[PDB]
Amino acid sequence: SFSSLYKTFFKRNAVFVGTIFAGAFVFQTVFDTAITSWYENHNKGKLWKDVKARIAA
Amino acid sequence: GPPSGKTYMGWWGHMGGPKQKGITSYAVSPYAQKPLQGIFHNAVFNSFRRFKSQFLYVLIPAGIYWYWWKNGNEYNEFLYSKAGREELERVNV
Amino acid sequence: GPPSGKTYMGWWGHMGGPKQKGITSYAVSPYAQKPLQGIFHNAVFNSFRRFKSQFLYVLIPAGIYWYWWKNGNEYNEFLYSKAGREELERVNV
Amino acid sequence: PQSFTSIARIGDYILKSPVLSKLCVPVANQFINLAGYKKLGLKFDDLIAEENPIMQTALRRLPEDESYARAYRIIRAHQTELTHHLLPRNEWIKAQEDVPYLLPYILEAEAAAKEKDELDNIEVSK
Amino acid sequence: MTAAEHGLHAPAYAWSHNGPFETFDHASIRRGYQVYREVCAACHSLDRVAWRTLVGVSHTNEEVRNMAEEFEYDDEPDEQGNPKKRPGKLSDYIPGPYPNEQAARAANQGALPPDLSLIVKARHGGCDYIFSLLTGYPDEPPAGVALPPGSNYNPYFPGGSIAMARVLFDDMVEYEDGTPATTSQMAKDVTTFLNWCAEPEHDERKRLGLKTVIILSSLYLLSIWVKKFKWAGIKTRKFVFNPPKPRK
Amino acid sequence: MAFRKSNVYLSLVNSYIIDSPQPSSINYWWNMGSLLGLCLVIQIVTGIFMAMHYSSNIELAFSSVEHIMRDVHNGYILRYLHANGASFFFMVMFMHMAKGLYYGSYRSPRVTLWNVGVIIFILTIATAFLGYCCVYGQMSHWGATVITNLFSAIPFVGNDIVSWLWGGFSVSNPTIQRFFALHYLVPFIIAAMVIMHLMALHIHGSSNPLGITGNLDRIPMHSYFIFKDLVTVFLFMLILALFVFYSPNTLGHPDNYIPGNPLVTPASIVPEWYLLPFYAILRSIPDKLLGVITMFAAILVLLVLPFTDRSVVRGNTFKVLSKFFFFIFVFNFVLLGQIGACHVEVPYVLMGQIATFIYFAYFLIIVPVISTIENVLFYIGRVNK
Amino acid sequence: MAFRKSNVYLSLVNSYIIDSPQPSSINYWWNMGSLLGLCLVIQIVTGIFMAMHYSSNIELAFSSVEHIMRDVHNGYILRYLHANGASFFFMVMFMHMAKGLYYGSYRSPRVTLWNVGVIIFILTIATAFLGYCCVYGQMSHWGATVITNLFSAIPFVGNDIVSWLWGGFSVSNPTIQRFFALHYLVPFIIAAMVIMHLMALHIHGSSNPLGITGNLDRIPMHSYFIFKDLVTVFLFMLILALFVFYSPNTLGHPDNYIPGNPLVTPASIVPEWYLLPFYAILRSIPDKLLGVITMFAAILVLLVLPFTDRSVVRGNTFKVLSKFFFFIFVFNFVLLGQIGACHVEVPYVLMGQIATFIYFAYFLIIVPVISTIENVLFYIGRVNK
Ligand SMILES: CCCCCCCCCCC(=O)OC[C@H](COP(=O)(O)OC[C@H](O)COP(=O)(O)OC[C@@H](COC(=O)CC)OC(=O)CCC)OC(=O)CCCCCCCC
Ligand SMILES: CCCCCCCCCCC(=O)OC[C@H](COP(=O)(O)OC[C@H](O)COP(=O)(O)OC[C@@H](COC(=O)CC)OC(=O)CCC)OC(=O)CCCCCCCC
Ligand SMILES: CCCCCCCCCCCCCCCCCC(=O)OC[C@H](COP(=O)(O)OCCN)OC(=O)CCCCCCCCCCCCC
Ligand code: HEM
Ligand code: HEM
Ligand code: HEM
Ligand code: HEM
Ligand code: HEM
Ligand SMILES: CCCCCCCCCCCCCCC(=O)O[C@H](COC(=O)CCCCCCCCCCCC)COP(=O)(O)O
Ligand SMILES: CCCCCCCCCCCCCCC(=O)O[C@H](COC(=O)CCCCCCCCCCCC)COP(=O)(O)O
Ligand SMILES: CCCCCCCCCCCCCCCCCC(=O)O[C@H](COC(=O)CCCCCC)COP(=O)(O)OCCN
Ligand SMILES: CCCCCCCCCCCCCCCCCC(=O)O[C@H](COC(=O)CCCCCC)COP(=O)(O)OCCN
Ligand SMILES: C/C=C(C)/C=C/C=C/[C@H](OC)[C@@H](C)[C@@H](OC)[C@@H](C)CCc1oc2c(O)c(OC)cc(OC)c2c(=O)c1C
Ligand SMILES: C/C=C(C)/C=C/C=C/[C@H](OC)[C@@H](C)[C@@H](OC)[C@@H](C)CCc1oc2c(O)c(OC)cc(OC)c2c(=O)c1C
């Protein structure tokens, strides 16, 4: 964190609850997508989706 | 302990009432009194005397409601009898 | 409020300690201090306090117990191996 | 909860005996140095658990100047402890300064308390 | 306790699901089901696994529906009260080979083959143990070992005397995907399938674990910094003593 | 005055959590109590949510827990949190108790606080026993059998008490159903006992690492300790999450994944880890009645400490000998646990008997002797004559 | 000082039930509170002992209660006590609330005490509902269906809330098992709210029948009120025993002796007697949403009393018009209950609607209008110029 970067968004005030809650909602979405993508990529070839791609009946 | 908010009641020695003076009370030990034999004649006349002062406050409202109930109940019994079928069809729809 | 029993701790303004005089304390606002930009390196020589000064009180008893455990464990393993069959029958029965 | 009267009785017996003294004092000196209370700016008498009637009587009778000084040593020690450091060497309590300043007040209170208890339970032999 | 009574320690194999970031190999779960069906199912039940759970894990909805319908289950009696049967459905649980314990014991020389739904979690050693057991039957028991009639020797089993004989032999199964059905390949596959049967939440649990440890680690570090800031005034506090003038 | 002080309900909150004067020097060891409060909350909440999907009937119990593991959304998280949470509850409690022992927290004027603590310890052990029985795995049935049989040692009426506890001829349906009902109840009794614990604590306040008066320098609970407690709350959650999500069955026993069988006690039977030290103590006595009495005595002996500690100073911080022996006691307790995890064989039997002697000797001989000696050393080590 | 005062635990007992200064004139109406505490204890104890033999699974629930009635030693006593105890809990609570209404107990400085009481009333009704569902008879299934459906009236998310509460397509296994878990929990929440109720009562003490200050003449709780409360405790037990042993099913519904059937709602369906007045209020509104809103408002309207009572004196003892209308309100409540026990037919529909209007009018119109008139009457009836 850089002082001037923080000041451009909040000046010398702490972050208010309203903004904290709003940020938590955004965090939840972005964080989940990022983790899931990294996790599925790390296990590529082992997932059912990957197996179903080749295997069939 | 922390300072707590004052109320309208204290405790023994500082109950929160006005200063008392000029009043003298007297009492006698329960052990020195007649073995609770002064019940009848001294409480049978007072009993019902208290309720003679209160019964109308209870009885009138009770009477209004009991009669309102009985009237509706009797009307319902009539509406569902053979003789009330005509009026039942009228008031039901 | 009811009379409560005396203890060894009071509250702010009457904590129950001795009268304090001659001591002056000074402090500076956390906002005016360096943003904790000296955790490691500056607190590495002070670290290991609970180690250099306390490790022996922990280490010696720990060493005594660990070696006591290892010794007994090695013996048990010997007793139940083919080579330990004769001693097992001796110490067991 | 061993009384200071009992402690002193055993200790004095050791100090008065040339044999026991030369044998115990050195170990006691090492024990005290290892205890490390002097490095926090404290004297042994500052360490005595005070939440009892005898100690409260003792502390109440302790002269003002000494009481203020004891207060400072206690506060300073708490501050040093929370910072997880020892005081600068020059601020350490020196062996010569580690004096039993409260002990006499404690022994006096214990003697008075002991006498009251004996007097409260005296038997009369007619 | 002797080595025989304890059982031979099961070595650590390189299971592809070992590790905090690893999911099960689903191609292995799939082959494992086939080994279970063509070999294990003759003596072992899998009572805790509902057909529906295989969907999207090792098979398609269509494949599982066809598998379920190959078995018959009790249906509600007809209008006359007469009992009747019906083909299995996705909601049904995989059926066992025996109708009761007495029948199971009768077909296995008095021994009862345990349900395998939780076998991986119900044994010390987990996957390593199951695999080692299945591939650890020697042609003959060690010299001097008196083996009771109807029993078999397996060093990995406590006591060395087990009621189940070796059942995996090379090529006894023909894998749909063309994988060589060696005894070790089949043992590796059923064990993976059985691990999934015991812990179907495995893949999702580890994924949630990554999210949880990251958030908590950050919270922990953040809390330390916040704590230090709030305490900075007290921590750097300074005291000075000036002995008061004697008068009070 | 401020509303937080004026209001009838808020004043209690302010008194215990906001304005509570805390000794400025208490270290992180003083954070275990808040962690124990967190543990109780975790257990009660996860427990209640799981109770909604649990059946106590002996034929349905094990399967209902599997239903929670398999069918209930996030059910495995609830179960692993509850199971591992229980283990963490005991680890933190042992640390909380060890902290008290080290710093002489049990000494006057906090004897009542300590005694209430011992009661909470007993209730927590009983609660965990009842909960473990509810799973109805092999360890559940046999643990229920052995533990209830402990009372058969009571002369004359022992067997009757056991039959009463069982509700039959053995651990059966009535036993499991009553154990679940009781498992639900005790946590609330513990909560009530914690309130009593906090009340005893509040009148004298916390002790500190120096063992001396904290009255000369206090700081408010709010902010300082509220934020300091947060550090360990997060560390606790982090560590618990590592077990819950990455190694959920490490602290448990594989045998409990096998349904209870009244006809077979597995050779691999072992009590839950937090009970191992007491288990070893019982096994060390070659007699039914004395083994039982001795084990219960291992908990009750905690009550003699305020009387056997003859020291004139509170705590071990400035005591060389006391610090050494405290750690001897700690590692001896761990050894007892390790012995409990072993079979009844040479030389573990003698080791257990010696460790058992050391456990009791600590409270009854070592503490009083060493403390008396230290009192004298402090005296002769400075005084002239 | 005396040990009962110095000890941390006994000092609470002493302040609340031994030395507590009571107004010398409080009459027998002030005994209902202790009776409510007794009821709560009776319910929790009989409930825990029955829980030991109960199975919540929808297929086993009804039969497990029959098992309690038939196989459990004294089981029928436990069950009849718990069931008749619940009815008594409500009758006494109604009397406790009515006393408060009559004597102006809801007035300042006791508004907080009153509000906590309203919360307790809501929790108690909810608890009784959950317990009734546990029997899983015909009334249980349909009461569970209707009451959970009350939430379907919430716009947009209503149906989702109901499906969530059910844990399925309809009232089924998931529902009964969670209802039992919750039935076990709420009584403990009620106990905690009772503690909060008592704390609020303690700071101002009880009011009295004269409505004036009790500070000039107090007498200790101990002996006087301890023994006066005992009189009603025995009367309460006597009457409860008459029902439990001689007429145990009089207060219940025969349909609850019929196992729940998801396909048939009996024509004879009727809510538990203590819920009838509220049931009548809901039925009085020919709209789904407004009916549900109005019914909950019937409980919440109790909260407006400290504000609508404009009188300068506390209580009805010396108020002619207020006394009359208080009894109009009481019998109107009984009538509402009678209407609830009747079919939706002429002329009961209109009667119920009028009685519903009267119920609300009392708090919103009658009390403020009458209290204002009375203030003026007291003024012009003595002052002159
Ligand atoms: C599995 C169930 C438990 C899981 C939850 C447990 C969490 C807490 C248990 C540990 C505990 O209570 O240890 C207390 C011991 C005393 O410490 P002290 O008061 O003298 O500290 C002065 C500090 O530098 C102030 O420093 P400060 O406040 O500025 O930051 C301290 C540190 C705190 O870290 C913690 O989370 C507490 C351990 O933050 C850091 O900088 C660490 C960077 C990663 O801290 C230690 O030095 C640890 C000694 C090791 C013994 C552990 C034995 C456990 C079997
Ligand atoms: C119902 C199912 C739930 C069961 C719970 C039952 C609990 C009792 C509820 C009744 C209640 O609270 O009534 C209070 C009302 C007010 O009375 P008060 O304070 O003005 O009394 C002065 C007394 O003479 C002092 O007199 P004393 O103390 O000397 O004895 C009083 C009397 C008390 O009896 C009771 O226990 C209450 C009925 O004992 C007797 O003499 C009875 C001889 C067999 O008592 C009365 O005076 C009755 C007035 C009519 C109320 C009818 C109840 C409506 C249902
Ligand atoms: C029924 C009877 C119950 C009894 C249970 C006994 C407890 C069982 C073990 C509990 C685990 C944790 C042990 C707790 C011991 C720490 C207690 C404590 O308060 O220690 C304080 C001490 C140093 O503090 P100081 O204030 O003296 O430091 C000098 C500052 N000037 O801190 C230190 O010296 C460093 C602490 C090092 C801890 C070593 C613990 C080893 C435990 C092994 C874990 C178990 C593995 C299976
Ligand atoms: C590849 C398919 C199979 C697998 C994965 C498998 C796995 C297992 C496992 C893990 C055990 C438990 C051993 C223990 O208690 O530690 C076991 C036991 C047993 N199995 Fe199998 N099995 C298979 C096939 C069979 C077959 C086909 C039969 C019947 C002919 C059989 C009969 C038994 C019996 C009787 C036992 C009891 C052993 C004892 O307790 O002594 N198994 N099996
Ligand atoms: C659910 C269980 C428990 C809870 C919630 C609990 C909670 C607390 C809390 C919040 C504190 C203050 C902070 C601290 O010192 O950690 C405390 C202090 C204390 N507790 Fe506990 N405790 C529990 C069990 C125990 C047990 C089992 C014992 C002892 C057998 C015990 C003994 C003490 C003592 C003596 C103190 C004072 C420590 C001091 O200030 O020096 N507690 N406890
Ligand atoms: C101090 C609180 C508690 C402790 C120490 C505790 C401890 C335990 C333990 C050790 C188990 C066995 C876990 C396992 O190995 O699977 C258990 C199970 C269980 N507990 Fe608790 N518990 C507590 C409170 C509660 C409460 C209040 C409920 C509410 C009913 C509850 C409900 C259950 C249920 C349903 C199970 C069975 C499922 C399972 O095995 O996890 N517990 N508990
Ligand atoms: C479990 C239920 C309850 C319990 C155990 C309880 C207990 C008590 C007790 C012991 C008293 C003092 C003695 C008395 O006046 O009877 C009291 C007073 C009072 N309670 Fe309750 N109560 C309960 C429910 C309620 C409810 C539902 C309300 C109101 C909606 C309420 C309103 C009041 C008020 C205003 C007083 C003061 C009476 C006065 O002194 O004038 N209580 N309660
Ligand atoms: C605030 C206290 C309570 C209230 C108002 C209450 C009310 C009720 C009611 C109305 C019933 C239905 C009785 C019937 O018609 O047969 C019931 C049943 C039941 N309650 Fe409670 N209860 C309370 C507390 C408890 C507690 C703490 C438990 C603990 C588990 C419990 C366990 C049961 C059980 C097992 C049943 C089923 C057996 C029966 O029907 O009597 N109750 N309760
Ligand atoms: C029963 C459980 C026992 C656990 C005890 C742990 C105690 C910690 C509770 C944290 C409360 C912090 C309140 C701070 C506050 O009100 O200050 C407010 C500021 O609050 C904030 O900025 C938000 C801090 C976010 C903390 C996150 C809460 C963690 C939730 C996890 C805890 C689970 C138990 C006033 O701040 P100001 O003094 O600068 O004006
Ligand atoms: C949950 C709360 C509900 C109950 C509220 C009612 C409170 C009544 C409690 C009665 C306690 C009486 C103790 C008297 C005492 O200590 O004085 C003792 C004397 O006690 C006696 O003589 C015994 C009287 C018999 C008590 C009957 C037990 C009541 C049955 C239980 C009913 C409740 C379930 C001191 O007497 P003294 O003043 O002459 O020296
Ligand atoms: C063991 C049981 C728990 C122990 C109880 C003590 C601990 C209580 C902790 C609870 C924290 C919650 C406090 C919130 C209430 C504070 C506001 C308040 O009391 O306002 C009250 C009114 O409250 C109500 O109407 C309902 C309160 C219900 C609370 C339900 C949780 C205003 O009261 P007030 O103090 O302003 O009185 C005027 C003095 N001139
Ligand atoms: C939901 C409920 C929440 C709990 C709210 C608290 C309500 C308190 C009601 C409890 C009444 C029972 C009190 C009996 C205990 C009084 C005697 C006492 O405190 O003696 C204590 C010692 O107590 C113990 O060791 C154990 C007490 C455990 C009590 C467990 C029920 C002596 O304490 P003392 O006042 O003499 O002070 C000691 C000198 N520093
Ligand atoms: C209705 C409620 C009831 C009856 C409550 C009873 C509570 C009793 C005690 O708690 C207070 C008790 C749990 C406590 O004794 C001090 C523990 C240390 C007991 C330790 C304990 O565990 C074992 C265990 O867990 C097992 O599992 C498979 C098996 C066991 O033998 C093989 C034992 C065992 O031999 C002992 C001593
Ligand atoms: C998980 C917990 C939950 C969802 C709790 C819900 C609690 C809701 C309310 O309590 C606060 C509620 C019980 C309370 O509403 C204020 C009562 C006055 C409702 C009264 C009530 O009873 C009925 C009843 O008993 C029946 O029996 C067979 C049948 C019923 O219709 C045919 C009713 C009915 O039509 C109403 C309005």
Side-chain angles (χ1 to χ4, degrees), chain E residues 36 40-48 94-98 113-117:
Chain E
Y36 166 74
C40 318
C43 307
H44 290 273
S45 59
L46 209 64
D47 300 331
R48 313 199 146 113
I94 290 171
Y98 311 111
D115 189 82
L116 301 180
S117 307

Side-chain angles (χ1 to χ4, degrees), chain F residues 203-229:
Chain F
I203 56 177
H204 299 294
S206 295
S207 185
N208 56 256
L210 302 181
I212 62 184
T213 186
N215 293 340
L216 295 68
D217 189 42
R218 323 291 298 211
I219 62 185
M221 178 92 147
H222 173 49
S223 281
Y224 299 109
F225 297 99
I226 290 297
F227 285 87
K228 190 174 181 183
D229 282 349

Side-chain angles (χ1 to χ4, degrees), chain G residues 204-222:
Chain G
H204 297 113
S206 300
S207 181
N208 56 252
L210 298 187
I212 60 188
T213 183
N215 292 342
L216 293 66
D217 192 51
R218 332 279 308 198
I219 59 181
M221 181 86 96
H222 177 48

Side-chain angles (χ1 to χ4, degrees), chain F residues 342-353:
Chain F
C342 293
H343 293 268
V344 183
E345 294 167 352
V346 177
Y348 301 144
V349 180
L350 229 196
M351 291 181 72
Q353 292 170 330

Side-chain angles (χ1 to χ4, degrees), chain F residues 7-77:
Chain F
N7 183 255
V8 66
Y9 305 125
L10 257 27
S11 57
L12 271 301
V13 172
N14 178 251
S15 178
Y16 283 78
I17 277 179
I18 304 168
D19 288 352
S20 189
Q22 226 51 62
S24 62
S25 67
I26 57 173
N27 59 40
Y28 279 103
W29 288 110
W30 270 261
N31 285 37
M32 303 310 276
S34 64
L35 246 35
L36 288 170
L38 207 213
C39 282
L40 184 59
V41 170
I42 286 167
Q43 299 307 111
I44 293 171
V45 178
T46 55
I48 287 169
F49 277 96
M50 281 193 296
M52 294 177 41
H53 306 276
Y54 176 81
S55 301
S56 67
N57 302 74
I58 199 163
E59 308 95 330
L60 274 23
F62 187 95
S63 286
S64 68
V65 176
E66 274 297 300
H67 161 76
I68 288 167
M69 296 299 295
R70 307 169 178 275
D71 312 326
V72 174
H73 296 287
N74 300 307
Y76 68 90
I77 300 173

